[PDB]
């Protein structure tokens, strides 16, 4: 038996072993899959033979990232802007400028009014109470109908709803207002913060990170899912798909939060969690890396096309690059090549597609979602609840944390709370 | 006698003679100076013979004047932009882009932030209700003093303290803050607004829409100053400085605010007026038109010199141009022609000064002040009082407009107010 058994090798599960066996607790980590690191999943292009890439979570900010940023200085681990980014293609209309930010002065009143809106809204949110707890219910309602409030022009509407579709990973009409307030508030009350965050990525993959923490970790388990959890005597009992149960006086669950309503719970998980949990929540996130010829450097494009954004990533070599694009599953095939190129072609006609690589992680069983984002009503009903303890079942995550949700610091913020709480126990 | 005496004619004595004698009334205007108009003051400049020019009040903006934009139809009264703003010459540090809005990236979360403050702010204030009734005094500070409090990087700072140099007509260390956030709450709660006011001109001077105006007032004395006014029997006398009196059942006074403390009330002001009135209010703008050789045509210019701003106004001929510049009478000397070349030049150095033009508005008797701006404090003690009848003496013009105060439209808005209280009376 350990003192805690940490379930998931994510980020969040690899902080809180490695913290817990420092105190110098005993601690078991099981992973279901082949490797740690979970939804931050660095390793060989499918297209590019020898070429590293993310397949999921590679951008950091360490002024918003803190805790990352003191895991990439205490494990010496390099980072660096992907590209610098010169050229901009918008596709949002004949007034909109070729920058970063692409709002003409024509519309600068309307943007100067709805920042202040957004920014007002925001600051209802306090960071430490759930979603749940603050009259927020007004606020947790279709983004679409939240933007037709601001009625902005052409333009800076487009821009806003592009950002927030890549950003959530739901079209305007599934996400929630609630929701793109809270990332603004995660970003110290800034929407600018929110893009701006995309400033860092791993020189060397986020795999470099993920194998500097699990050195640390004495016992770790691959290829062992968990399928139950039980509480109800003394000791809390793991069970596994094919394996013994594990005992231990503390568990920590560090899967995802659409995985959890596989898991036996003994007893139930508290009533009002329970709706939500098997729900799931709604984030339908699809990045997709495209290998593409005749692009030039630096490109960043964000329009009303069904690929909202897409911008530089890599040089493969001196006429080929990946790019990336985000859309939502939902929306969107990516296995559908033709749409690819449609979606491509849009901003950049003179481009071809070579080919395209991402990980369906809606349908991994050890995920069932990419990133988190609330369906419309989920959070206002139950949010901080859904990362607290249940007796001696801890509950860890990016897609739990209030702080900063659906970011790799998150998962790490999340792990620091249930190391505590375990502590001080 | 008269149902009414209105005392100056300037935009609000004129609009207010005017709507009375259309409503039937008897009415005299008194002038002091040998022209209509006050601080609306077209003429020939002294630089260009044949060129005219606006001295005073030139600007205005439809949207945001909406009783001047009606005059301008009443009247068919042609307008237009100035000139078209094509080259920017910022002295704001090295990183400012020389385009309109000259913030660089790197300073985006701080103007974004800096925006929600000031508009929070600025949403304190309700217009009807007078900045003295709104417990509004921590607002009430030098604006120097408010702005550390945003902690503003150098590009973004400046450009706002110059703009507020500009459009207040005092040092940063000199005006309230509180008064800033007027002007804002004032342009639709819009801190860009307070400079997109300035839209068009009038195409043949202001001088057009007074001659129209008092084309419709059948009694005009000029050259008289009145010096009295005495509602202490049943009808009110003015005494003029060299003149019988004149009676009437109402007085409208429609003087610059710095001149009542010269006029003799009879019984005296009510006494919470008083103070303020003998001080005068803190304005000290200074328009200086600058004739230039060898300056391309559509320069702005903003940045930290002793001339906070200095844009383009008109063609002179193939090679020389009027340029406006403002500052304020306390820290410049536009008889210092050394200094103009100076101020010039700093951000100019390829330009030749061949002259100025401008009105000592602060030694002016019939003035004593350009456009209202308070004193720190003031306007937290009185202000809404400043603008109120006391009995059958009715207190108008820009001055004491609470909706568009130190604009043509605040002259407008406080004629409209006497009219009717006076229609009601
Ligand atoms: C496409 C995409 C792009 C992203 N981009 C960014 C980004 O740029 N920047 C950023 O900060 N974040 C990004 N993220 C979000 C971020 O990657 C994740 O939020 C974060 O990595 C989650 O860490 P975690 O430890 O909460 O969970 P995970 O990393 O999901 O770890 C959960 C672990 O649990 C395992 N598991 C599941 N079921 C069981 C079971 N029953 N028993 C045992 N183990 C199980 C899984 O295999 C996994 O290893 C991205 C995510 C995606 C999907
Ligand atoms: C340099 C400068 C630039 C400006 N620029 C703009 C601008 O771009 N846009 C804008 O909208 N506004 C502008 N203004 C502000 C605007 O011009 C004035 O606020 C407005 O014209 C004032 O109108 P009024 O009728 O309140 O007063 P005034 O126009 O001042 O009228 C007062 C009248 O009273 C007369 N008078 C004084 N004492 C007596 C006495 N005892 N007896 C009889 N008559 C007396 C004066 O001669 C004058 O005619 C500017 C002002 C200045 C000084
Ligand atoms: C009394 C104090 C007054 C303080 C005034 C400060 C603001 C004055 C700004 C006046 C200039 C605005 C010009 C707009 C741009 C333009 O017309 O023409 C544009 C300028 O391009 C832009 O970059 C506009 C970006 C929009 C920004 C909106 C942000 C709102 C935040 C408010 C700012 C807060 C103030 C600073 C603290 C150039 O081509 P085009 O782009 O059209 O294609
Ligand atoms: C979840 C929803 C997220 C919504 C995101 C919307 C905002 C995303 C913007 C991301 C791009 C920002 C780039 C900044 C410019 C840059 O880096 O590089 C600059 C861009 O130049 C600019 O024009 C910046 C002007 C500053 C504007 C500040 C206004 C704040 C208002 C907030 C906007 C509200 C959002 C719209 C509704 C180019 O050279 P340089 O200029 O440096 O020299
Ligand atoms: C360049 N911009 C403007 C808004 C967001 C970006 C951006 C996108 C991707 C990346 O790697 N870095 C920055
Ligand atoms: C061009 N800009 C940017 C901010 C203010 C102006 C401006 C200045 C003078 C004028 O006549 N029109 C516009
Ligand atoms: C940083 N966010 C957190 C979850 C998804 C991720 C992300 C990264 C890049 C991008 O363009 N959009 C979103
Ligand atoms: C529009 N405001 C009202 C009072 C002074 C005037 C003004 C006009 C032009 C400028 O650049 N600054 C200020």
Same mark, same amino acid.
């Given at each position: +038996? ?26 078991? #980590? ?30 950091? &900010? ?22 610098? $980014? ?6 949002? @209309? %004949?007034?909109?400028?070729? =920058? ?19 920014? *007002?809204?925001? &600051? *209802?949110? /306090? ?14 309602? %279709? ?14 509407? =487009?821009? #806003? ?9 739901? %079209?305007? /009409? =599934?996400?929630?207002?609630?929701? +793109? ?31 500097? +923490? ?28 094919? @394996?013994?149960?594990? =005992? ?8 995802? +939060? ?11 998980? %508290? ?10 929540? !709604? ?5 997709? #890396? ?7 450097? !630096? ?26 694009? $985000? ?29 395209? /690589? ?35 079942? &801890? ?31």
């Amino acid at each position: +038996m350990y003192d805690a058994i940490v379930v998931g090798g994510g980020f969040s599960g690899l902080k809180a072993a490695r913290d817990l066996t420092n105190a110098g607790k005993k601690v078991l #980590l099981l992973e279901g899959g082949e490797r740690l690191g979970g939804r931050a999943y660095s390793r060989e292009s499918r297209n590019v033979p020898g070429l590293r890439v993310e397949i999921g979570g590679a951008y950091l &900010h360490r002024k918003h990232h803190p805790r990352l940023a003191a895991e990439l200085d205490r494990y010496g681990i390099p980072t660096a802007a992907a590209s610098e $980014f010169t050229s901009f293609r918008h596709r949002l @209309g %004949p007034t909109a400028v070729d =920058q970063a930010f692409p709002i003409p002065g024509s519309e600068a009143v309307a943007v100067e009014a709805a920042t202040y809106t957004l920014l *007002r809204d925001a &600051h *209802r949110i /306090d960071l430490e109470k759930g979603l749940e707890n603050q009259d927020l219910e007004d606020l947790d309602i %279709p983004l679409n109908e939240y933007v037709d409030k601001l009625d902005l022009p052409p333009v800076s509407r =487009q821009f #806003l709803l592009a950002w927030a579709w890549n950003m959530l990973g739901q %079209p305007a /009409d =599934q996400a929630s207002a609630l929701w +793109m307030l809270q990332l603004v508030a995660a970003h110290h009350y800034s929407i600018l913060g929110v893009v701006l965050s995309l400033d860092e990525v791993f020189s060397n993959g986020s795999a470099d990170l993920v194998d500097a +923490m699990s050195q640390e970790i004495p016992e770790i388990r691959l290829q062992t899912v968990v399928t139950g959890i039980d509480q109800s005597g003394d000791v809390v009992n793991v069970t596994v798909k094919d @394996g013994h149960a594990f =005992q231990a006086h503390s568990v920590i669950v560090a899967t995802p +939060m659409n995985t959890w309503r596989r898991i036996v719970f003994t007893p139930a998980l %508290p009533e009002r969690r329970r709706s939500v949990i098997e729900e799931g929540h !709604g984030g339908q996130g699809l990045k997709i #890396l495209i290998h593409v010829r005749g692009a030039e450097a !630096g490109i960043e494009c964000v329009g009303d096309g069904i690929f909202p954004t897409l911008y530089d990533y890599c040089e493969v070599s001196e006429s080929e690059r990946l790019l990336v694009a $985000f859309t939502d599953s939902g929306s969107f095939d990516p296995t559908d090549i033709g749409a690819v190129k449609d979606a491509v072609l849009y901003y950049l006609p003179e481009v071809e597609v070579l080919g395209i /690589d991402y990980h369906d992680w809606i349908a991994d069983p050890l995920f069932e979602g990419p990133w988190v984002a609330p369906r419309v009503g989920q959070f206002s009903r139950v949010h901080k609840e859904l990362g607290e303890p249940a007796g001696r079942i &801890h509950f860890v995550g990016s897609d739990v944390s209030l702080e900063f949700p659906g970011y790799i610091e998150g998962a790490l913020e999340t792990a620091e709370c249930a190391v505590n709480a375990i502590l001080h126990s």
